[PDB]
């Protein structure tokens, strides 16, 4: 063949922490289809918003927004348990079909994004060069987000285990845990990845009695 219909940029969705997660890679030949199962980032979430992105930047806000839609009717469950299957499907028409499906409630929502959406040829090259020019900063952000998300799970799991523990946890330790939790929460708001890591370790340090109780 002398030519191919290909994606000139990555297509994906925004995920926890404000990152773009890619579903169809840059330079994928069409037709193509890809599905992936995701879950929730907190306990009892009843709906999710699927924010569709085009581009090459790691921070979702720096990509081109193609659309969004909701999937509601998610049964309340602990975080990470619901199964939300997100499908990107682009056939020869160059129309992007995005669906999200709750594999338990069976509820599904879909949208279509026409061939003309997203960046034009000039904006496509600028986006590729902006990605290049900011590669440094983009990778730091990706690593910081992975660390943030890991700290967030630890914070929230520790808080659950304190609840289940009740008066079984010594007042002394309960107070020391609560302190470390607050410090980690503070470190999470910042941009210093090592500081989050030290606060994760410091919280696990004071949790020994808590972990035995569980």
């Amino acid at each position: 063949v002398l030519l191919l219909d290909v994606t000139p940029l990555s297509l994906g969705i925004e995920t926890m922490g404000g990152v773009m997660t890619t579903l169809i890679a840059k330079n994928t030949t069409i037709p193509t289809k890809h599905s992936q199962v995701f879950s929730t980032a907190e306990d009892n979430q009843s709906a999710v918003t699927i924010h569709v992105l085009q581009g090459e930047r790691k921070r979702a806000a720096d990509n081109k927004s193609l659309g969004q839609f909701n999937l509601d009717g998610i049964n309340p469950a602990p975080r990470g348990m619901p199964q939300i299957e997100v499908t990107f499907d682009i056939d020869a028409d160059g129309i992007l079909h995005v669906s999200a499906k709750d594999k338990n409630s069976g509820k599904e929502q879909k949208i279509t994004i026409k061939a003309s959406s997203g960046l034009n040829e000039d904006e496509i090259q600028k986006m590729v060069r902006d990605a290049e020019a900011n590669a440094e900063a983009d990778r730091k952000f990706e690593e910081l987000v992975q660390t943030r998300n890991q700290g967030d799970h630890l914070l929230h799991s520790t808080r659950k285990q304190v609840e289940e523990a009740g008066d079984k946890l010594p007042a002394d330790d309960k107070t020391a845990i609560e302190s470390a939790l607050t410090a980690l929460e503070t470190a999470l708001k910042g941009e210093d990845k090592a500081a989050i890591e030290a606060k994760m370790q410091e919280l696990a340090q004071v949790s020994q009695k808590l972990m035995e109780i569980a």
Binding site: E14, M16, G17, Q36, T40, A41, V48, T49, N70, I84
Partner: peptide
């Protein structure tokens, strides 16, 4: 590494 969608 499992991934999660944010709360709306």
């Amino acid at each position: 590494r499992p991934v999660y969608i944010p709360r709306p």
